[PDB]
């Protein structure tokens, strides 16, 4: 086509979606990771994660307001990944990289799994 | 912080949100622009438009599944802007620029209003 494109649009949309999450506006699901609860927007979770895409395209699960993750999932790892979904920034540290990578494999977030593998390889 | 950032994340999120819209997945509102109907995600509309942000933060309107726009709004202008919200690309043409600018002023999409004003000024 002959369209023009606003370079910062996608980043500005994501920033506004994170502001809605902050302010708990139109959040429609609670993700439970053992004793912790995280509120989010189903559409953002599906856009970032192959696991959430599969969950919320299921004719029964699409209607659930609470999703319980596998008890082996680390709440801090999930929190770091949820922040990444809404900001593009990943708080990857020596002390959390193993939990983050395991969580990203479970959530099916291939680009995160890729950077974790590279950072681990560099330390070996 | 000491975060790393995935450059293409915001663009990839927006591309996936547009794929959900295409496939009518988790769309939660119908916008009526006279005889036409457009299905969308309230969160994407709020993230892009000051008018939708004001509508869906209202304690009564946040619960509506149908929103009727002012009868003066052109459906093609709205369609072009809805596509821009989900893709960052604006199909601006000599034949639609006046309707697009009027719609963007109504929807409170300041960056679109800005490029329309510049394109109009260039033709004068």
């Amino acid at each position: 086509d002959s369209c023009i494109q606003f370079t910062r649009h996608a980043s500005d949309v994501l920033l506004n979606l994170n502001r809605l999450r902050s302010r708990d506006i139109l959040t429609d699901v609670v993700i439970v990771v053992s004793r912790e609860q995280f509120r989010a927007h189903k559409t953002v979770l599906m856009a970032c994660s192959g696991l959430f895409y599969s969950i919320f395209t299921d004719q029964l699960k699409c209607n659930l307001s609470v999703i319980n993750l596998d008890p082996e999932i680390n709440p801090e790892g999930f929190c770091i990944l949820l922040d990444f979904m809404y900001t593009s920034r990943l708080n990857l540290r020596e002390g959390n990289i193993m939990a983050v990578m395991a969580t990203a494999m479970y959530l099916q977030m291939e680009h995160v799994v890729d950077t974790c593998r590279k950072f681990i390889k560099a330390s070996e | 912080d000491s975060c790393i950032q995935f450059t293409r994340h915001a663009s990839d999120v927006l591309l996936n949100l547009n794929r959900l819209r295409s496939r009518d997945i988790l769309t939660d509102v119908v916008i009526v622009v006279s005889r036409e109907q457009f299905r969308a995600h309230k969160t994407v509309l709020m993230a892009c438009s000051g008018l939708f942000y004001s509508i869906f933060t209202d304690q009564l309107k946040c619960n509506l599944s149908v929103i009727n726009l002012d009868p003066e709004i052109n459906p093609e202008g709205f369609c072009i802007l809805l596509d821009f919200m989900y893709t960052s690309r604006l199909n601006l043409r000599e034949g639609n620029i006046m309707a697009v600018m009027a719609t963007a002023m109504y929807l409170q999409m300041e960056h679109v209003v800005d490029t329309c004003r510049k394109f109009i000024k260039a033709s004068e």
Binding site: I4, Q5, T7 | -
Partner: peptide, 4 residues
């Protein structure tokens, strides 16, 4: 704004 750019030409994509």
């Amino acid at each position: 704004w750019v030409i994509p």
